[PDB]
Assembly symmetry: D2
Homo-oligomer: 94 residues x 4
């Protein structure tokens, strides 16, 4: 598992960051609920920058997508990034 | 499980429809690979009409979302609609 | 996926065999609820023998285990044989 | 979620206890790798007693089963106790 993904897995699932980034209820996507606080408070700790565009570009490079309504709270999804599915994470690729 | 969801589960999971509507590799979302052909050919088999707008409105009413690139086919997701998670399907609500 | 496992996956999940072999409610194990009928009616169709000991030996060769009470209905489990987890099935090995 | 199950979920999932109690690779069962040391060392941390018999009786009362070879460590399973399946845990009942 690439370091970025291992750090992302830990970060999403950590209860100490859930006020800003957390799994969805079923774990098949994850939410960043306050992008500005996330980029200033959380991204420094785990990725040593504060640039939300940069983090998003790295998600894009691993194939993550965005979840939006059919008709701030941003929601990301990757088919192989699912809470608890540790072995499935090995299928995320650049 | 409301009949809409049971029908949708069967439609998505049916190998015979996978050329037009299928689970994602991990089963946490589903893909419609061509909306016009899907509505004409496969929608009636399971839903007995051919109106894509009606179908998508129902998805919206059950809380489905779309999955789009971070930056014709469509991908839909619901936290409680996951391949194999039959009991979880009981949590999808209007 | 080895043919035996592909056939086993299809067999367990098939609604037309659920009266004799079926997934548990959450799909993390599966049950054979009438071993004699299963071996006489189901195993011929899918594995061209009627020998429950043989089928069990093949499960044992792929690392399947039995689920029993802490203190007929036989229940089998393999960590990588889970309803809906199609990609995980690729990790079952002899 | 009853306190027993919340404590068990935390105990199993804690990396700091994985040398004695851990999820299986796929998370559909959990393993206790040495019962005597587990009861003396790690059980009190999460349950505040050191009585393996009491703990196993509680597992039985919540419907947990053992996973054994088809033919000292122990492996326990419950259809509704699955790594990452937080909502499913609400289905475990006394
Ligand atoms: Na978190
Ligand atoms: Na999981
Ligand atoms: Na299909
Ligand atoms: Na599943
Ligand atoms: Na079946
Ligand atoms: Na699944
Ligand atoms: Na642990
Ligand atoms: Na999960």
């Amino acid at each position: 598992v690439p370091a970025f993904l291992g750090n992302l897995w830990a970060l999403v699932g950590d209860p100490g960051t859930d006020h800003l980034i957390r799994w969805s209820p079923s774990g098949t996507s994850f939410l960043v609920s306050d992008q500005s606080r996330f980029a200033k408070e959380v991204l420094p700790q785990y990725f040593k920058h504060s640039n939300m565009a940069s983090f998003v570009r790295q998600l894009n490079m691993y194939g993550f997508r965005k979840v939006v309504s059919i008709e701030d709270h941003v929601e990301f999804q990757h088919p192989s990034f699912v809470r608890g599915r540790e072995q499935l994470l090995e299928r995320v690729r650049r």
